[PDB]
């Protein structure tokens with residue numbers, strides 16, 4: 797009677813595509829204006845490897861600055877999509893901070909976690925090399941996936957593959 801509930805948290809610096817990825821996954825729409833300061837949760841039934849489950853997505857927005865609240869939000873998460881934009885090197889640099897924030901709270905270096913390089917449809921504006929992102933993912937023992945919220949490339953993959961990590965590790 798009770799479905800598995802996979803609790804996913806989007807993290808990453810501003811403008812990288814957290815909301816656009818979420819809204820593409822949820823509603824099959826590329827949304828380009830979503831309030832940068834708006835954090836919201838989303839829930840959908842999805843059939844994961846043939847099992848009906850519920851995904852809950854917390855689309856964070858960095859507005860909450862009070863560390864105890866931010867940590868409470870992370871503590872509740874079971875898996876993390878750590879998003880940067882391949883067109884903004886500083887957003888890639890910033891991923892280290894989210895990683896540490898998550899590790900401090902979850903206290904488990906194997907927490908379900910994907911490094912997501914979004915905006916793969918903007919190859920001509922790339923600032924982060926595939927090599928260096930892959931190297932960082934290797935250092936963290938996480939998978940690296942490049943996505944485009946615009947074209948839908950690997951959007952279902954990152955949510956499904958994270959749910960597979962949650963299923964396996966919890």
Ligand SMILES: Nc1nc2c(ncn2[C@@H]2O[C@H](COP(=O)(O)OP(=O)(O)O)[C@@H](O)[C@H]2O)c(=O)[nH]1
Nearest residue numbers: 810811812813814815816827828915944945946
């Ligand atoms: N070209 C392109 N633009 C994107 C992609 N994902 C997000 N954007 C754009 O980047 C801006 C910020 O995206 P948003 O999801 O609001 O970033 P957030 O601050 O991480 O939630 C928006 O104007 C989006 O249209 C993508 O995959 N490709």
Ligand SMILES: *S(=O)(=O)c1ccc(S(=O)(=O)Nc2cc(F)cc(OC)c2)c2c1OCCO2
Nearest residue numbers: 807833835855856857858859860866869870
């Ligand atoms: S709450 O459900 O009232 C809530 C959720 C999310 C945010 S936020 O994403 O704007 N701030 C966060 C939340 C995180 F889990 C992590 C952050 O750093 C990655 C930032 C939020 C609230 O309520 C208060 C305002 O912010």
Ligand SMILES: [Ca+2]
Nearest residue numbers: 801802803874
């Ligand atoms: Ca769960």
Ligand SMILES: [Ca+2]
Nearest residue numbers: 814815832857
């Ligand atoms: Ca957003």
Ligand SMILES: [Ca+2]
Nearest residue numbers: 820821823824
């Ligand atoms: Ca869909």
